[PDB]
Amino acid sequence: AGVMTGAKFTQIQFGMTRQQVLDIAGAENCETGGSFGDSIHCRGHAAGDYYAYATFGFTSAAADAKVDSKSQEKLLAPSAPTLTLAKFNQVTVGMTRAQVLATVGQGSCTTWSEYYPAYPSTAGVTLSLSCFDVDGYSSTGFYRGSAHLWFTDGVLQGKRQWDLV
Template identity: 40%
Template sequence: MVGIKKAVVVAGVAVGFVVGAAGASGAAGFSGMDKEKWDRVRFGMSRQEVLDIVGPTACAVDNKPATAESTVPTFTCWATGIEEFAPYAHLTFNADGKLYMKSFYRMSLPTAPTMTAAQYNKVAVGMTEEQVRKTVGTNSCVVTDLAQPAFPSTAGATSTLTCWTGKGSGFLAPQAWFSFKDGKVTGKHQRDVVK
């Protein structure tokens, strides 16, 4: 039950952010971010280096174009504009202005998800990402966020593996989130996978 509530809150925050942004600045026209660019931005890059990759019109800070001089820690970079449920990425910089965390929403989806409730239940704390993928189906998941909080050290690195069931990968389709630290599962939660 706690997992369901947490997942609903996470999904609600994502929807609220997107809907709120759409209402505030639906005509801002930010676009151009995609998964290939998300993959190319690396930890330790400056704001300018990140903008050189993602493009000058993709990212926003407080509904204004992000610049190398922006002091807000997180850029929100949009794939197709600020619209309800539109794909976007968050790129977050540390106090030294270096990228140390990145996440995305719906910029990449699994090719053929097949995870079942029974498979979800088999995932245990301490498993590696490879073990989780083998357990729930290699085509069921995508890594949706990465962080290296002690950059340049990799100690304490975190990630989230988001997985879908055979019911597809639509916004309201059953989903599970597996949290990792230093390459091992530290927790999991789900929405509508296990009822």
């Protein structure tokens, strides 16, 4: 079974029911209600002063509601991180996702959150990426050089960085 993992995160899909999510994640790893409202929040291994985790949001509180949002921290590692301060400074609001990735490096980013507020329509889709310099990613501690890049409808709306170069 195990705790929440990157593999489980990838297997969980938009359009799934709460039961499908629980069956994949392992219900012993997950919680709902309280701080998390009608979302399902699932813990991975301890990291920093919290845990690696995923949070899955649903179209409503109904039993047949479907996953319309997927978020995670420290479950997914970047495939080839090459972000720098210079590259980050070249990123501009208004860029498409493809333009941003060409600027920061195609393997520099992971998906922090992705939400379809009009599911099953893609209208208003919001996407948040976490992007990393070469030794920036950490699954168990604190990042050493990262950026947050966020999009609506595939167009960059803002950017923020910590400790680049």
